[PDB]
């Protein structure tokens, strides 16, 4: 409906960079410890995107301290300050769930040239 569309598009962020699955992004999230706010960086590969307007999300997967960790960010959430595509990967799928059973040499993604 028009009411829901108006309500969501008046809250959407207009500076969201364009990205695709397979890209290596670096998202800066707000961390509030005690009374002070800081910026924690989380960098990994985008393994899934869910386009739903204001309810859009994307799942980033990284290998932190030897343990695979993935986090699903809400694209229009104010906790995300900025997103930056460090490197663009070339895949032929919309959801890279197969990466969870791969480590090291078997989980490399070819760069998306041109």
């Amino acid at each position: 409906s028009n009411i829901i569309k108006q309500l969501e598009q008046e809250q959407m962020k207009q500076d969201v960079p364009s990205f695709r699955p397979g890209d290596t992004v670096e998202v800066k999230v707000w961390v509030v410890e005690g009374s002070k706010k800081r910026l924690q960086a989380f960098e990994g590969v985008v393994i899934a995107i869910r386009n739903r307007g204001l309810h859009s999300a994307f799942t980033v997967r990284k290998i932190s301290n030897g343990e695979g960790v993935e986090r699903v960010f809400q694209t229009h959430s104010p906790v995300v300050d900025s997103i930056s595509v460090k490197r663009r990967g070339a895949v032929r799928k919309a959801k890279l769930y197969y990466l969870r059973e791969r480590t090291g040499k078997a989980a490399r993604i070819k760069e998306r040239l041109n």
Binding site: S64, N65, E67, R71, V72, Q74, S77, V79
Partner: protein
Amino acid sequence: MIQEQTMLNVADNSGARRVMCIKVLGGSHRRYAGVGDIIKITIKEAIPRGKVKKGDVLKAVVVRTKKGVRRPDGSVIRFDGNACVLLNNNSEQPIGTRIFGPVTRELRSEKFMKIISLAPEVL
């Protein structure tokens, strides 16, 4: 989301390698355990000369679950495996002197300040 018979990896250098949850503490008829809640575990595998032996019964706090936790904005942090940190049966303080792998913001409290201080990364 940890319940009885669940095997977990150990996130500290306390000597245990693979533990099994035998009760979810903190309430009658309780089904699952998220992060930051005590469970009673048994040790099913240990390293040769560690601080704990195979078969000891003691407490532990869960620091990573494969189901993950949810934050007030709707996000979710999922890990590749279930991991816990062994605690003393009476004081409920960590046995080891180091933490392996990341943890989350759900733990920052006076009870587990030692754990979040020793953690290599607090997501």
